[PDB]
Amino acid sequence: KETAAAKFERQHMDSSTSAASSSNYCNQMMKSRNLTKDRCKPVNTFVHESLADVQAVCSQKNVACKNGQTNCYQSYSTMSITDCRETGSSKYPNCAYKTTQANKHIIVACEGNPYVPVHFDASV
Numbered sequence: 001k002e003t004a005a006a007k008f009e010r011q012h013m014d015s016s017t018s019a020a021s022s023s024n025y026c027n028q029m030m031k032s033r034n035l036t037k038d039r040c041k042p043v044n045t046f047v048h049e050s051l052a053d054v055q056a057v058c059s060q061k062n063v064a065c066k067n068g069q070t071n072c073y074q075s076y077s078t079m080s081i082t083d084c085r086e087t088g089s090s091k092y093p094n095c096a097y098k099t100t101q102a103n104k105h106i107i108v109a110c111e112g113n114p115y116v117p118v119h120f121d122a123s124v
């Protein structure tokens, strides 16, 4: 069983690229990170920062989670992110995505000991 922390790193971390490598990025990364396996994951965000910098958000600004839980944290600094958004043309198993790059504050849900990111909640 994949740990919640490892699943967060697979679904949301991409420290290799500074920003949305290309117009191809989401099509390749949604597939390579196994987010198009059983269905086309409809939206997903990748963060282009060090793992240590993303883990550190669990000690930053405490905010409400979209689901009403209290364990979400907002980054004090903006981070380089890529939003991936499934198109209309997109029909499983040929999942098609729009790659958008932005610099935004991330919001992540944290749990455990050690206290680490487990859920990408939002960017603002």
Ligand SMILES: [Au+]
Pocket: 076, 077, 078, 105
């Ligand atoms: Au800011």
